[PDB]
Design an enzyme around this catalytic site. Structure first.
Site, PDB file in Angstrom:
ATOM      1  N   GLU A  78       0.945  -1.297   0.041  1.00  0.00           N
ATOM      2  CA  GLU A  78       0.003   0.022   0.092  1.00  0.00           C
ATOM      3  C   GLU A  78       0.983   1.278  -0.031  1.00  0.00           C
ATOM      4  O   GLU A  78       0.560   2.291  -0.600  1.00  0.00           O
ATOM      5  CB  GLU A  78      -0.999   0.057   1.162  1.00  0.00           C
ATOM      6  CG  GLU A  78      -1.755   1.208   1.067  1.00  0.00           C
ATOM      7  CD  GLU A  78      -2.767   0.901   0.145  1.00  0.00           C
ATOM      8  OE1 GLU A  78      -3.850   0.366   0.468  1.00  0.00           O
ATOM      9  OE2 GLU A  78      -2.994   1.897  -0.694  1.00  0.00           O
ATOM     10  N   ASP A 168     -13.111  -0.772  -1.813  1.00  0.00           N
ATOM     11  CA  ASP A 168     -12.879  -1.701  -2.794  1.00  0.00           C
ATOM     12  C   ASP A 168     -14.177  -2.790  -2.773  1.00  0.00           C
ATOM     13  O   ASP A 168     -14.018  -3.693  -3.623  1.00  0.00           O
ATOM     14  CB  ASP A 168     -11.692  -2.351  -2.535  1.00  0.00           C
ATOM     15  CG  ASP A 168     -10.469  -1.556  -2.702  1.00  0.00           C
ATOM     16  OD1 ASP A 168     -10.787  -0.317  -3.223  1.00  0.00           O
ATOM     17  OD2 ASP A 168      -9.410  -2.036  -2.649  1.00  0.00           O
ATOM     18  N   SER A 285      -7.408   2.552  -3.735  1.00  0.00           N
ATOM     19  CA  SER A 285      -6.192   2.630  -2.921  1.00  0.00           C
ATOM     20  C   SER A 285      -5.020   3.338  -4.240  1.00  0.00           C
ATOM     21  O   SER A 285      -4.118   3.954  -3.756  1.00  0.00           O
ATOM     22  CB  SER A 285      -5.378   1.626  -2.623  1.00  0.00           C
ATOM     23  OG  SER A 285      -6.261   1.210  -1.240  1.00  0.00           O
TER      24      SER A 285
END
Ligand SMILES: [Ca+2]
Lengths: 368, 4
Positions: A78, A168, A285
């Site tokens: 991430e 998501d 993200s």
């Protein structure tokens, strides 16, 4: 157009930002959980492979000096995605990249809350990326929502932009994170805060020469465990509608999200260095850091004087459709459920993606 | 929390 992965240095071309300044004059933050040691090595690989000047970084321990800021191995993917996508979208330069690290040894969600708080208290980053979230009803039940909303309110008042991934799980954020649940729809915190810019997700198609072709809703269906991978979008059950959203008629008196969207499909995602290896990664993200890097260019073009832009986005885009790529096709559910894209603002994608040079010209003429 |  074609669906493929993209080097993050391609996002300026794709979203019409090549003629804008880089973000060299704007400091950008990233909220992380734990440390970023591998991420900084991956960032070095990124700038060196792309022949760019190195990026000035700082890491900030936001809680206890005795907290746990060790690297989370999954987490490094991430922070890699976020940092490389920001710097690519920014044109290859940021003034400084600040990693606001949440303590992992703190009770409840207090480590994360203190990471947001530090970014606001320091007030050095103009734009801060948040590629994370969870069911807003959960955040509400334990008081985390209320505590963090106060911090975001202070950010907005002081002219900072928090950018937050919308989720998501499509419409199924509170259902075991993404398991189809028929007509029961929910949203992610902190995207549902009216004090942040919520960023949803698209499927990005490009021409053979690498130009923008089109975008549809991000919805890649169910994985092998039966969980939905799609853009979060809908409305908060708790947050009231801020006045600038009244331009979206026929919606409830709640904070509608997302505001805007960028590339999120894994199949059209970013090529990211992660523990030294290139991976093709999507999610909202991805979409949030693309916005952050692009917005940081507009800040640098405007002497960092642009305040919290939500009201301006809604007034400008509703009256000026040329500022966006309007997503019209797809849905963010499964099995016939979920919300549908359409003309103008919709629940999967908000206003769609920004055409940065056109937005820049708009700001030159009208301010923001 | 979740990383998106
Ligand atoms: Ca639309």
């Amino acid at each position: 157009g074609t669906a493929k992965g993209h080097n993050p240095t391609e996002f300026p071309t794709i979203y019409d930002a090549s003629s804008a300044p880089t973000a060299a004059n704007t400091t950008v933050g990233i909220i992380t959980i734990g440390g970023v040691s591998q991420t900084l090595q991956d960032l070095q690989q990124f700038t060196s492979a792309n022949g760019l000047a190195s990026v000035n970084t700082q890491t900030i321990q936001t809680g206890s000096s005795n907290g746990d800021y060790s690297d989370d191995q999954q987490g490094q993917g991430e922070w890699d995605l976020d940092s490389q996508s920001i710097v690519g979208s920014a044109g290859g330069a940021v003034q400084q990249l600040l990693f606001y690290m949440a303590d992992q040894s703190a009770s409840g969600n207090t480590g994360l809350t203190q990471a947001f708080n530090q970014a606001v208290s320091d007030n050095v980053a103009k734009v801060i990326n948040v590629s994370l979230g969870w069911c807003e009803a959960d955040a509400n039940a334990d008081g985390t929502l209320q505590a963090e909303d106060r911090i975001f309110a202070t950010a907005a008042a002081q002219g900072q932009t928090f950018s937050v991934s919308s989720g998501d799980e499509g419409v199924y954020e509170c259902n075991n994170r993404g398991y189809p649940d028929g007509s029961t729809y929910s949203v992610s915190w902190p995207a549902s805060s009216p004090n942040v810019i919520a960023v949803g997700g698209t499927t990005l198609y490009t021409t053979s020469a690498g130009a923008y072709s089109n975008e549809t809703v991000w919805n890649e269906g169910l994985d092998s465990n039966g969980k939905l991978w799609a853009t979060g979008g809908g409305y908060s059950v708790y947050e009231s509608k801020p006045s600038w959203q009244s331009v979206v008629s026929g919606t409830p008196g709640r904070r509608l999200l997302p505001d805007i969207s960028f590339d999120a499909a894994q199949g059209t995602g970013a090529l990211i260095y992660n523990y030294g290896q290139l991976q093709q990664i999507g999610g909202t993200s991805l979409a949030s850091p693309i916005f952050v890097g692009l917005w940081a260019r507009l800040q640098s073009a405007n002497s960092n004087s642009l305040g919290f832009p939500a009201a301006s986005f809604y007034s400008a885009i509703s009256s000026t459709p040329s500022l966006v790529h309007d997503v019209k096709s797809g849905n963010n559910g499964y099995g016939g459920y979920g919300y549908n894209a359409g003309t103008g603002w919709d629940y999967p994608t908000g206003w769609g993606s920004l055409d940065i040079a056109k937005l820049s010209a708009y700001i030159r003429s009208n301010g923001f | 929390x979740y990383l998106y």
